[PDB]
Every structure is written in structure tokens, then in C-alpha cells.
Amino acid sequence: HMDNYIRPIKDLTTAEWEEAVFKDISPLMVLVHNRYKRPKENEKFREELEKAIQVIWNCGLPSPRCVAVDAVVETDLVSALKVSVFPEIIFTKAGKILYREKGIRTADELSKIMAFFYYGAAKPPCLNGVVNSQEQIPLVDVSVN
């Protein structure tokens, strides 16, 4: 009721990464994409991810925060997450990692996943048989000369 619309996928940076989580306890998803690694899939992900956010809006709840980080540019961040597959949707909450989605997923199948770790929504089949693990979020050393 207080809110209905939510800012679309924004480009996050290491400089605003710490605050993106530490300062922003709210639910946010980190989409680590790579311009060199899987240049095509990179679009397939954002395509579904974007829609996934809209799907929730209809559900009647304020979707989480969507953010994408460049793996080719933000090498520090990536190294911190220890990600190997790209792109990658690391579902984080309260400055802590919950689950890491590695593979193409539909806006719906995704919405349920994130919503399951946020709004305790239903759990999809693709996720039902996945490997998840909780782990604090690595704080990257940022310098502001």
C-alpha cells in the first residue's frame, strides 16, 4: 500500500557496494554479468530478471532491489563473491548471501526463488533441487582519494 513501483535494474559499483548491502539491509539481488564471458546469455538473464521484478509487483508486494555488477570491470567485487559462472544472480539479504542461482531462469521461476528467501513465497521445482548455502557478504576495500 505504501509503495507499488520499484526502481528497475541499476548499475552497481564497488564504490557503492558496501553501502548497497551494509547500509542497505533491504532485500537486494546482485547480478554479476560479464561482457566477455557469455555475451549472449548476459542479455537472456537481464531479460528474465527484469520481468521477474514486474511479476512481483502484480502479486501485491514491493519487489526487492535489483542491481547488476560488471565482472570484467568490477574484478574486486567478483573475487570477493568467488563467483565462477557468469552471469550470476546472487540473492543477498541484510548484507548476507543466501542462495546463488547459476543458470538461465524465467521471470516467474526466479520471482518465486527470491520471494521464497524474502517474502517466504513458494519454492519452484528448479530451485527445489538446487544447492543453496548461507554466507556473510564480503566487504570490498574501497578507497576515496
XYZ file of N, CA, C and O in Angstrom:
580
model
N 0.828 -1.201 0.000
C 0.000 0.000 0.000
C 0.865 1.256 0.000
O 0.580 2.219 -0.711
N 1.924 1.239 0.803
C 2.832 2.377 0.895
C 3.558 2.601 -0.427
O 3.798 3.740 -0.829
N 3.906 1.509 -1.098
C 4.606 1.586 -2.376
C 4.093 0.523 -3.342
O 3.591 -0.519 -2.923
N 4.221 0.795 -4.636
C 3.768 -0.138 -5.662
C 4.837 -0.328 -6.734
O 5.073 -1.443 -7.200
N 5.481 0.768 -7.120
C 6.523 0.724 -8.138
C 7.902 0.590 -7.500
O 8.120 1.022 -6.368
N 8.832 -0.011 -8.236
C 10.191 -0.200 -7.744
C 11.216 0.098 -8.833
O 11.055 -0.315 -9.982
N 12.271 0.816 -8.464
C 13.324 1.169 -9.409
C 13.822 -0.066 -10.155
O 14.049 -1.125 -9.569
N 13.995 0.071 -11.477
C 14.469 -1.023 -12.331
C 15.932 -1.366 -12.076
O 16.608 -0.699 -11.292
N 16.414 -2.410 -12.742
C 17.798 -2.841 -12.587
C 18.761 -1.672 -12.770
O 18.782 -1.029 -13.819
N 19.559 -1.404 -11.741
C 20.528 -0.316 -11.788
C 21.954 -0.856 -11.788
O 22.210 -1.957 -11.301
N 22.878 -0.074 -12.334
C 24.279 -0.473 -12.396
C 24.993 -0.151 -11.086
O 25.224 1.014 -10.763
N 25.339 -1.192 -10.337
C 26.026 -1.021 -9.061
C 27.539 -1.031 -9.251
O 28.052 -1.613 -10.208
N 28.251 -0.383 -8.334
C 29.705 -0.318 -8.401
C 30.331 -0.596 -7.039
O 29.710 -0.367 -6.000
N 31.564 -1.090 -7.049
C 32.275 -1.401 -5.815
C 32.242 -0.221 -4.851
O 32.128 -0.400 -3.638
N 32.340 0.987 -5.397
C 32.318 2.196 -4.585
C 31.033 2.288 -3.769
O 31.044 2.744 -2.626
N 29.927 1.852 -4.364
C 28.634 1.886 -3.692
C 28.151 0.475 -3.369
O 26.954 0.241 -3.196
N 29.090 -0.461 -3.290
C 28.760 -1.850 -2.989
C 28.552 -2.047 -1.491
O 27.524 -2.571 -1.063
N 29.533 -1.623 -0.700
C 29.455 -1.755 0.750
C 28.117 -1.239 1.272
O 27.419 -1.932 2.010
N 27.769 -0.016 0.883
C 26.515 0.593 1.312
C 25.320 -0.128 0.697
O 24.260 -0.236 1.314
N 25.499 -0.622 -0.524
C 24.437 -1.335 -1.224
C 23.901 -2.486 -0.381
O 22.774 -2.941 -0.577
N 24.717 -2.956 0.559
C 24.324 -4.055 1.432
C 24.358 -3.633 2.897
O 23.323 -3.576 3.561
N 25.554 -3.337 3.394
C 25.724 -2.919 4.781
C 24.740 -1.809 5.138
O 23.955 -1.939 6.078
N 24.788 -0.718 4.382
C 23.902 0.417 4.618
C 22.475 0.089 4.191
O 21.512 0.581 4.780
N 22.346 -0.745 3.165
C 21.035 -1.141 2.661
C 20.696 -2.564 3.090
O 20.980 -3.524 2.373
N 20.087 -2.694 4.264
C 19.709 -4.000 4.788
C 18.585 -4.619 3.964
O 18.437 -5.840 3.914
N 17.794 -3.767 3.318
C 16.682 -4.229 2.496
C 17.127 -5.349 1.560
O 18.313 -5.535 1.293
N 16.150 -6.113 1.049
C 16.415 -7.228 0.134
C 16.894 -6.753 -1.234
O 16.229 -5.953 -1.893
N 18.051 -7.252 -1.655
C 18.620 -6.880 -2.946
C 19.302 -8.074 -3.607
O 19.859 -8.936 -2.927
N 19.255 -8.116 -4.934
C 19.872 -9.203 -5.686
C 21.041 -8.691 -6.521
O 20.904 -7.729 -7.274
N 22.192 -9.342 -6.380
C 23.385 -8.954 -7.122
C 23.553 -9.803 -8.377
O 23.815 -11.004 -8.296
N 23.401 -9.172 -9.536
C 23.536 -9.870 -10.810
C 24.914 -9.630 -11.419
O 25.140 -8.626 -12.093
N 25.833 -10.561 -11.177
C 27.187 -10.453 -11.704
C 27.253 -10.922 -13.153
O 27.302 -12.120 -13.427
N 27.253 -9.967 -14.078
C 27.313 -10.281 -15.501
C 28.711 -10.023 -16.056
O 29.491 -9.271 -15.474
N 29.020 -10.653 -17.185
C 30.324 -10.491 -17.818
C 30.173 -10.166 -19.300
O 29.436 -10.837 -20.022
N 30.877 -9.130 -19.748
C 30.821 -8.716 -21.144
C 31.622 -9.667 -22.027
O 31.317 -9.841 -23.208
N 32.647 -10.281 -21.448
C 33.494 -11.214 -22.182
C 32.948 -12.635 -22.089
O 32.864 -13.348 -23.089
N 32.578 -13.041 -20.879
C 32.038 -14.376 -20.652
C 30.548 -14.423 -20.976
O 29.748 -13.711 -20.368
N 30.182 -15.267 -21.935
C 28.788 -15.407 -22.339
C 28.162 -14.042 -22.610
O 27.393 -13.514 -21.807
N 28.498 -13.456 -23.769
C 27.980 -12.146 -24.173
C 26.495 -12.190 -24.514
O 25.779 -11.202 -24.348
N 26.035 -13.342 -24.991
C 24.633 -13.517 -25.353
C 23.780 -13.780 -24.117
O 22.828 -13.050 -23.842
N 24.129 -14.826 -23.374
C 23.394 -15.184 -22.166
C 23.207 -13.968 -21.263
O 22.196 -13.843 -20.575
N 24.191 -13.075 -21.272
C 24.136 -11.869 -20.453
C 22.815 -11.133 -20.656
O 22.248 -10.584 -19.712
N 22.332 -11.128 -21.895
C 21.077 -10.459 -22.222
C 19.883 -11.318 -21.821
O 18.855 -10.806 -21.378
N 20.024 -12.630 -21.980
C 18.958 -13.563 -21.636
C 18.622 -13.480 -20.150
O 17.463 -13.618 -19.758
N 19.641 -13.251 -19.329
C 19.453 -13.149 -17.887
C 18.704 -11.869 -17.525
O 17.614 -11.916 -16.956
N 19.299 -10.729 -17.859
C 18.691 -9.436 -17.568
C 17.251 -9.388 -18.071
O 16.386 -8.774 -17.447
N 17.003 -10.038 -19.204
C 15.668 -10.068 -19.790
C 14.663 -10.691 -18.826
O 13.605 -10.123 -18.563
N 15.004 -11.866 -18.303
C 14.131 -12.568 -17.369
C 14.105 -11.864 -16.016
O 13.040 -11.643 -15.438
N 15.285 -11.515 -15.514
C 15.399 -10.836 -14.228
C 14.491 -9.611 -14.175
O 13.712 -9.444 -13.238
N 14.596 -8.759 -15.191
C 13.782 -7.552 -15.261
C 12.300 -7.883 -15.118
O 11.611 -7.343 -14.252
N 11.815 -8.778 -15.972
C 10.416 -9.185 -15.943
C 10.047 -9.765 -14.582
O 8.975 -9.484 -14.047
N 10.943 -10.573 -14.025
C 10.712 -11.189 -12.724
C 10.313 -10.146 -11.686
O 9.448 -10.393 -10.845
N 10.949 -8.981 -11.750
C 10.658 -7.901 -10.815
C 9.241 -7.373 -11.007
O 8.537 -7.091 -10.038
N 8.830 -7.244 -12.264
C 7.495 -6.751 -12.584
C 6.426 -7.739 -12.128
O 5.376 -7.343 -11.623
N 6.702 -9.026 -12.311
C 5.764 -10.071 -11.918
C 5.360 -9.926 -10.455
O 4.185 -10.049 -10.110
N 6.342 -9.664 -9.599
C 6.089 -9.500 -8.173
C 5.161 -8.319 -7.912
O 4.269 -8.393 -7.066
N 5.375 -7.232 -8.645
C 4.556 -6.035 -8.493
C 3.072 -6.379 -8.556
O 2.269 -5.842 -7.796
N 2.716 -7.279 -9.467
C 1.326 -7.694 -9.629
C 0.866 -8.526 -8.436
O -0.304 -8.485 -8.053
N 1.792 -9.279 -7.854
C 1.481 -10.121 -6.704
C 0.884 -9.294 -5.570
O 0.067 -9.786 -4.792
N 1.299 -8.034 -5.481
C 0.796 -7.159 -4.438
C 1.816 -6.919 -3.341
O 1.454 -6.718 -2.181
N 3.093 -6.943 -3.707
C 4.168 -6.727 -2.746
C 5.326 -5.968 -3.384
O 5.629 -6.129 -4.567
N 5.992 -5.122 -2.585
C 7.130 -4.323 -3.050
C 8.360 -5.176 -3.334
O 9.098 -5.542 -2.420
N 8.575 -5.491 -4.608
C 9.716 -6.305 -5.012
C 11.009 -5.767 -4.406
O 11.103 -4.604 -4.012
N 12.031 -6.633 -4.332
C 13.338 -6.267 -3.777
C 14.098 -5.297 -4.673
O 13.546 -4.767 -5.638
N 15.367 -5.070 -4.350
C 16.202 -4.162 -5.127
C 17.050 -4.932 -6.135
O 17.752 -5.878 -5.776
N 16.979 -4.521 -7.396
C 17.739 -5.173 -8.457
C 19.002 -4.385 -8.783
O 18.955 -3.173 -8.994
N 20.134 -5.082 -8.823
C 21.413 -4.447 -9.124
C 22.323 -5.389 -9.903
O 22.384 -6.585 -9.621
N 23.032 -4.840 -10.884
C 23.943 -5.631 -11.703
C 25.361 -5.072 -11.642
O 25.567 -3.862 -11.729
N 26.337 -5.962 -11.491
C 27.735 -5.558 -11.420
C 28.551 -6.200 -12.536
O 28.414 -7.393 -12.812
N 29.400 -5.402 -13.175
C 30.240 -5.893 -14.260
C 31.410 -6.709 -13.718
O 32.190 -6.223 -12.899
N 31.523 -7.950 -14.178
C 32.597 -8.833 -13.740
C 33.924 -8.446 -14.384
O 34.987 -8.615 -13.789
N 33.853 -7.925 -15.606
C 35.049 -7.514 -16.331
C 35.633 -6.233 -15.746
O 36.849 -6.046 -15.726
N 34.756 -5.353 -15.272
C 35.185 -4.089 -14.684
C 35.422 -4.232 -13.185
O 36.521 -3.980 -12.694
N 34.381 -4.637 -12.464
C 34.475 -4.813 -11.020
C 35.082 -6.169 -10.675
O 34.386 -7.075 -10.215
N 36.385 -6.304 -10.901
C 37.086 -7.550 -10.617
C 37.168 -7.804 -9.117
O 37.038 -8.940 -8.662
N 37.384 -6.740 -8.352
C 37.481 -6.848 -6.900
C 36.230 -7.499 -6.319
O 36.313 -8.501 -5.607
N 35.074 -6.923 -6.625
C 33.805 -7.447 -6.132
C 33.671 -8.934 -6.444
O 33.466 -9.751 -5.545
N 33.791 -9.278 -7.721
C 33.688 -10.668 -8.152
C 34.566 -11.575 -7.296
O 34.090 -12.553 -6.721
N 35.851 -11.243 -7.218
C 36.798 -12.029 -6.436
C 36.269 -12.268 -5.025
O 36.478 -13.332 -4.444
N 35.584 -11.268 -4.479
C 35.024 -11.368 -3.137
C 33.917 -12.415 -3.081
O 33.878 -13.245 -2.172
N 33.018 -12.370 -4.057
C 31.907 -13.316 -4.119
C 32.400 -14.712 -4.483
O 31.747 -15.712 -4.182
N 33.559 -14.774 -5.131
C 34.143 -16.049 -5.533
C 33.279 -16.735 -6.585
O 33.185 -17.962 -6.622
N 32.650 -15.936 -7.442
C 31.795 -16.467 -8.497
C 32.626 -17.030 -9.645
O 33.700 -16.516 -9.959
N 32.121 -18.089 -10.269
C 32.818 -18.724 -11.382
C 31.972 -18.674 -12.652
O 32.498 -18.545 -13.757
N 30.657 -18.777 -12.485
C 29.738 -18.743 -13.616
C 29.199 -17.335 -13.843
O 28.951 -16.592 -12.894
N 29.021 -16.973 -15.109
C 28.512 -15.653 -15.464
C 27.572 -15.737 -16.662
O 27.832 -16.438 -17.640
N 26.450 -15.004 -16.585
C 26.129 -14.167 -15.427
C 25.791 -14.993 -14.190
O 25.890 -16.220 -14.206
N 25.391 -14.313 -13.120
C 25.039 -14.986 -11.875
C 24.175 -14.086 -10.997
O 24.500 -12.919 -10.775
N 23.073 -14.638 -10.500
C 22.162 -13.886 -9.645
C 22.312 -14.299 -8.185
O 21.667 -15.241 -7.725
N 23.167 -13.585 -7.459
C 23.400 -13.875 -6.049
C 22.365 -13.184 -5.168
O 22.420 -11.971 -4.962
N 21.423 -13.963 -4.648
C 20.375 -13.427 -3.787
C 20.917 -13.128 -2.392
O 21.229 -14.041 -1.627
N 21.027 -11.844 -2.070
C 21.533 -11.424 -0.769
C 20.452 -10.712 0.037
O 19.528 -10.126 -0.526
N 20.575 -10.766 1.359
C 19.610 -10.125 2.244
C 20.267 -9.713 3.559
O 20.935 -10.517 4.208
N 20.071 -8.456 3.943
C 20.642 -7.938 5.181
C 22.166 -7.998 5.149
O 22.808 -8.225 6.173
N 22.737 -7.794 3.967
C 24.181 -7.828 3.826
C 24.746 -9.224 3.996
O 25.866 -9.395 4.479
N 23.970 -10.228 3.603
C 24.399 -11.617 3.715
C 23.856 -12.450 2.558
O 22.688 -12.325 2.186
N 24.709 -13.298 1.993
C 24.313 -14.152 0.880
C 23.437 -15.305 1.357
O 23.658 -15.863 2.432
N 22.443 -15.658 0.549
C 21.533 -16.747 0.887
C 21.638 -17.879 -0.131
O 21.915 -19.025 0.226
N 21.416 -17.550 -1.398
C 21.484 -18.538 -2.468
C 22.044 -17.920 -3.745
O 21.860 -16.732 -4.006
N 22.729 -18.738 -4.539
C 23.317 -18.273 -5.790
C 22.762 -19.057 -6.976
O 23.024 -20.251 -7.119
N 21.995 -18.377 -7.822
C 21.402 -19.010 -8.994
C 22.392 -19.038 -10.156
O 22.821 -17.993 -10.646
N 22.750 -20.240 -10.592
C 23.687 -20.406 -11.697
C 23.017 -21.099 -12.879
O 23.013 -22.325 -12.972
N 22.453 -20.303 -13.784
C 21.789 -20.858 -14.949
C 20.594 -20.034 -15.382
O 20.023 -19.288 -14.586
N 20.214 -20.167 -16.649
C 19.077 -19.427 -17.186
C 17.796 -19.764 -16.433
O 17.505 -20.931 -16.173
N 17.033 -18.732 -16.085
C 15.781 -18.918 -15.361
C 14.718 -17.940 -15.851
O 15.035 -16.849 -16.327
N 13.456 -18.337 -15.735
C 12.346 -17.496 -16.167
C 11.969 -16.486 -15.090
O 12.200 -16.715 -13.902
N 11.389 -15.368 -15.512
C 10.977 -14.323 -14.581
C 10.131 -14.898 -13.449
O 10.274 -14.501 -12.294
N 9.251 -15.832 -13.791
C 8.382 -16.461 -12.803
C 9.185 -17.356 -11.864
O 9.176 -17.164 -10.649
N 9.879 -18.334 -12.438
C 10.687 -19.259 -11.652
C 11.620 -18.503 -10.711
O 11.875 -18.938 -9.586
N 12.129 -17.368 -11.178
C 13.036 -16.550 -10.380
C 12.284 -15.843 -9.256
O 12.676 -15.919 -8.092
N 11.204 -15.157 -9.614
C 10.398 -14.435 -8.635
C 10.121 -15.304 -7.412
O 10.252 -14.855 -6.274
N 9.739 -16.553 -7.657
C 9.443 -17.487 -6.577
C 10.677 -17.727 -5.713
O 10.585 -17.783 -4.486
N 11.829 -17.867 -6.359
C 13.081 -18.097 -5.648
C 13.379 -16.959 -4.678
O 13.382 -17.153 -3.462
N 13.627 -15.773 -5.223
C 13.923 -14.603 -4.404
C 12.817 -14.361 -3.382
O 13.088 -14.086 -2.214
N 11.570 -14.464 -3.830
C 10.424 -14.258 -2.954
C 10.397 -15.291 -1.832
O 9.880 -15.029 -0.746
N 10.957 -16.465 -2.102
C 10.995 -17.538 -1.117
C 11.966 -17.205 0.013
O 11.764 -17.607 1.158
N 13.020 -16.467 -0.319
C 14.024 -16.080 0.665
C 13.723 -14.695 1.232
O 14.414 -14.218 2.133
N 12.690 -14.055 0.697
C 12.299 -12.725 1.146
C 10.891 -12.739 1.733
O 10.710 -12.617 2.945
N 9.897 -12.890 0.866
C 8.504 -12.919 1.296
C 8.050 -14.349 1.574
O 6.855 -14.644 1.571
N 9.013 -15.232 1.816
C 8.694 -16.621 2.094
C 7.710 -17.200 1.097
O 6.881 -18.038 1.448
N 7.802 -16.752 -0.151
C 6.914 -17.231 -1.202
C 7.112 -18.723 -1.450
O 7.888 -19.380 -0.755
N 6.405 -19.252 -2.444
C 6.505 -20.667 -2.783
C 7.844 -20.980 -3.441
O 8.482 -20.102 -4.025
N 8.266 -22.236 -3.346
C 9.530 -22.666 -3.933
C 9.292 -23.475 -5.203
O 8.588 -24.486 -5.203
N 9.893 -23.024 -6.315
C 9.762 -23.694 -7.612
C 10.485 -25.036 -7.648
O 11.261 -25.374 -6.754
N 10.227 -25.820 -8.705
C 10.845 -27.138 -8.883
C 12.335 -27.042 -9.193
O 13.145 -27.775 -8.624
N 12.688 -26.137 -10.098
C 14.082 -25.946 -10.485
C 14.942 -25.607 -9.271
O 16.098 -26.020 -9.180
N 14.370 -24.851 -8.340
C 15.084 -24.453 -7.132
C 14.992 -25.540 -6.065
O 15.929 -25.745 -5.294
N 13.859 -26.233 -6.028
C 13.648 -27.300 -5.056
C 14.818 -28.278 -5.059
O 15.184 -28.830 -4.021
N 15.403 -28.490 -6.235
C 16.526 -29.402 -6.351
C 17.825 -28.685 -6.660
O 18.561 -29.080 -7.566
N 18.110 -27.627 -5.908
C 19.329 -26.852 -6.106
C 20.175 -26.826 -4.838
O 19.708 -27.188 -3.759
N 21.425 -26.395 -4.976
C 22.337 -26.318 -3.842
C 22.477 -24.884 -3.343
O 23.061 -24.037 -4.015
N 21.934 -24.621 -2.159
C 21.997 -23.289 -1.569
C 22.802 -23.305 -0.273
O 22.952 -24.348 0.363
N 23.318 -22.142 0.112
C 24.110 -22.023 1.331
C 24.175 -20.572 1.797
O 24.311 -19.655 0.988
N 24.077 -20.372 3.107
C 24.123 -19.033 3.682
C 25.554 -18.642 4.034
O 26.299 -19.431 4.615
N 25.932 -17.418 3.678
C 27.276 -16.923 3.956
C 27.312 -15.398 3.920
O 26.797 -14.777 2.991
N 27.924 -14.802 4.938
C 28.027 -13.350 5.023
C 28.588 -12.767 3.731
O 29.264 -13.459 2.968
N 28.302 -11.492 3.489
C 28.779 -10.816 2.289
C 30.155 -10.200 2.515
O 30.388 -9.479 3.485
N 31.090 -10.488 1.597
C 32.459 -9.970 1.673
C 32.527 -8.468 1.413
O 32.041 -7.983 0.390
N 33.131 -7.739 2.344
C 33.263 -6.292 2.214
C 34.522 -5.926 1.435
O 35.639 -6.180 1.887
N 34.335 -5.327 0.264
C 35.455 -4.924 -0.577
C 36.079 -3.627 -0.075
O 35.376 -2.713 0.356
N 37.405 -3.555 -0.133
C 38.126 -2.368 0.316
C 38.030 -1.252 -0.720
O 38.652 -1.319 -1.781
N 37.248 -0.224 -0.404
C 37.071 0.907 -1.305
C 37.863 2.119 -0.829
O 37.881 2.433 0.362
N 38.518 2.797 -1.766
C 39.316 3.974 -1.442
C 38.780 5.209 -2.159
O 38.549 5.189 -3.368
N 38.581 6.285 -1.403
C 38.073 7.530 -1.965
C 39.095 8.653 -1.829
O 38.990 9.497 -0.940
N 40.085 8.656 -2.716
C 41.127 9.675 -2.695
C 40.545 11.055 -2.983
O 41.024 11.771 -3.862
